[PDB]
Amino acid sequence: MLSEQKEIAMQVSGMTCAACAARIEKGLKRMPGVTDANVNLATETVNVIYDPAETGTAAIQEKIEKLGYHVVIEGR
């Protein structure tokens, strides 16, 4: 309505399968502006839905670093 949210999808560095990366994104599921977080280690990739009024890659990387991993942004 007012805001317009979006999905993003990108690769992570440091995952070790076995519900590890899930913790990374579950951390982001606690960021103010996220909607959902969905991990795809079948492609060493994760997707996360957020509102770019509060939230996106800017805040996300910051937290991801503290989760103890580095995320990439595929291009741009």
UniProtKB/Swiss-Prot annotation:
This is Copper-exporting P-type ATPase. Cu(+) 1 binds at residues 17, 20. It comes from Bacillus subtilis (strain 168). It is found in: Cell membrane. Involved in copper export. Residues 6-72 form the HMA domain. Disulfide bonds: none annotated. Induction: By Cu(2+). The gene is copA. The chain holds residues 1 to 75 of 802 of the full protein.
